[PDB]
Amino acid sequence: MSVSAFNRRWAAVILEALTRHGVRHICIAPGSRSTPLTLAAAENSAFIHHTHFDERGLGHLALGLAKVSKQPVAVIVTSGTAVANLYPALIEAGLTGEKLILLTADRPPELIDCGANQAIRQPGMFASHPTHSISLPRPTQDIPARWLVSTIDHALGTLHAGGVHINCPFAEPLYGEMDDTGLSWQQRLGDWWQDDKPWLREAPRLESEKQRDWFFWRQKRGVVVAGRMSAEEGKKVALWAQTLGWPLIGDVLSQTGQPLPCADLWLGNAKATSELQQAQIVVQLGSSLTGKRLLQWQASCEPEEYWIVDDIEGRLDPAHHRGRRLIANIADWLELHPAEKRQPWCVEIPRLAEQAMQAVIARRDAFGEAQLAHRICDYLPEQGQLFVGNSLVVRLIDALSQLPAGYPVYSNRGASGIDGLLSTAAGVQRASGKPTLAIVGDLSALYDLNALALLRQVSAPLVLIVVNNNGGQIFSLLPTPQSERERFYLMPQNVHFEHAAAMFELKYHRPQNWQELETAFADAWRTPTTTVIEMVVNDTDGAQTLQQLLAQVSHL
Template sequence: MKNPGLREARRRESDKQRDWFFWRQKRGVVVAGRMSAEEGKKVAQWAQTLGWPLIGDVLSQTGQPLPCADLWLGNAKAVTELQQAQIVVQLGSSLTGKRLLQWQATCEPEEYWVIDNIEGRLDPAHHRGRRLVAKIADWLELHPAEKRKPWCVEIPRLAELAWQRVVAQRDTFGEAQLAHRIRDYLPEQGQLFVGNSLVVRLIDALSQLPAGYPVYSNRGASGIDGLLSTAAGVQRASAKSTLAIVGDLSALYDLNALALLRQVSAPFVLIVVNNNGGQIFSLLPTPQSKRERFYLMPQNVHFDHAAAMFNLRYHRPENWEELELALASAWRTPATTLIELVVNETDGRADVAAASGAGKPSMMLHAQKMPGQSGMPWLVFPARFFLAIAASGSRSASSFTPVRGSILTYRDMADRRLSRSADLPMSSNYCALL
């Protein structure tokens, strides 16, 4: 009698696609999701040889050759150029960027292939294409690249321009700038663990991690639960120097896991970005009177006593120089150092208010035209930029209609407050939150 709790193993569909030699000569796009460091390097080389643009997730470890995708994907020229793709090959799952997910949901190439070692549904947009279950490295070996000239012209230019504009804002002491600078703080021959919520999204959109540098995360239905425990397990299994970055609520949810960090085999740095609660939820269209108590839930805590309770070294830098000194000291000692970055908790709300025309941005919220661009201004949210508005020219909130297959978190995110802004055109294409 068969055990109903067991499922018969499915056949691994790693066979060579017979028409690959045809498709590799076409205009293609490579989307890289979660994969190993070794796979990330191979995918980057594979895409470069094909001459196809590679849109890499923060967990792809591909080096993100086209950084700041969540910024330049909001540009009409980039979207238009991507529409010329005849095939999209997605390697790996668990994409982070909302603009990338939106483009994935609405793109209509002739072929869409998803390759991952994990079985099951990995394409939220349910494209009609090929779902191939295979190890990424094995699949690449069966489907070699052919040297071809890159076909995208605008996207590399837009990615470079986006990167330079982010670089120009790196001196301000804040969480967006930390996300951009994080590659400068990585330990040599070490590894990075990124938390959930706002942290991973900021790094995904504003930074460019080295190709093949190990990046770990614990993303899934568990949300922010157990992040410190996971980071401790990553360090214990690898015995490498580890940099972990989480938010203050994430740290509080797993505070007792600091006990696991009292004995480490290599330097371990835990950066806690303290914006006093779940500031990512400041982007939700919630009643102002209830937002702080029921959504942001500020805890008004600091972590110096927690570090002392578990006998961990502690720093609270107030500028980049102090942070760099604390890191330099931490990497010299095989112990755990907790570094708390206290940042302005109202930055997110200020930027959203600026987007609605109701206030001034906290840092640099621009609605500006890219060189040579017609139509919609390109919105840059260095602090909390996950409110994405694509071009259509319509200013009526009632005209907002999600495109078939879109993955909007909130249909009503075409908030009528946005339509009152004289500077920001509303979108009839898509609008993303978080």
């Protein structure tokens, strides 16, 4: 009889099913049409609930939670442009593998395409970007609960990576006291309600087989390239490459300790590129390589075979080398393809890389963004994690710093958007509970400015460094035309972030020299709150510093 009651019973099945697949964090934005989903989630004690008013931010908060915890994270939004706002986070999840479960409330079919308020066409809205799309029917008892839980069990069970869009139509009335309507319909699931398993267990694993000729290839002159991977995997890749005697080119996202640091610099040296030409095989573990010189070297290297090992699917080599694309957990893959101790074949590169670090160290004194990135190791929170933003900061750190082996780094380097970095960082912190250092540019912070509301709640100290060089100065680094650069590229906004911090009652510092930067950190790490540290620097110094070091190191 009661439509509102059945809606919530219908919804309760969906949310309880999710808990059988390890969903613990759920991010909720406010709405009315989402009432059945939101009320079922609120009443279910298995969940940790997060809220936000900005659905674009909500998406990235969830992206952050899934990024660190490696479990699927659910999102609830109401119908309309609220759903559309989940698109950036969904597209990023599609690239880097985070499991986002988007539960999008909808008008029922009779309120579609008839000029009803807050009614849009939602099925298929995200095109091909979700891993799996479910368009749920108009709730009705004539469809049994076992069908509904199975549909969800299928989507979550077979989810190797990426997002699941579950569109959820609900007809009014949405509110009203609880009736018995739908109760017996639910009870057709029996003691599944007391169980901890899915109704339907469908969980095939996707993995490449062992390469039987590995023991043949590990004898050749090889190069190891390490991109984004877990902290423990980075440590393991360093030992593995060192044992093999192959040079290790380590991205800032690899957490390998970068035993050959400043690769973006020494790879620019002809002696380095000449020596790497003797490489017969390249084994790349991880992907989304950061540095330009590395991308250029990868694009041009012509080994007999090119392998990329990663747990995400699809092609990952933008140069399309002859070789192999191996789907596996990186740590698992290393145990299956073990190193055996062999004499190092590189002699020139270890010298060049050390000279390269030396040239950077010689310029460490100036109070600029290049120097911050170079020295950032000195500022990492103990037993914490680094969240690196996009544009210059991730590049300067890749090229100029040597990050410690196994110290956790997180990022949004799938599509490399600057639209969710503060809110993503909030999720990265909440997932692990660790003290967090997050570094972003001035435009990035403006972009996700209202996410400072989320940073009012962290479980441990989070230092947010906003590097303010007045615009997107990455476009001072690229060869953009001078006449239009300022108006159409840099887009300086001429702001500071003191009032932003005060509005959300966050501590704020604007250090003028290294001593004052060091004082600000000492203060910030004392409490489980977010501290904003704004570093004001001359617009083009970072880019020019990077360019000069490249030129200097290439002539060594």
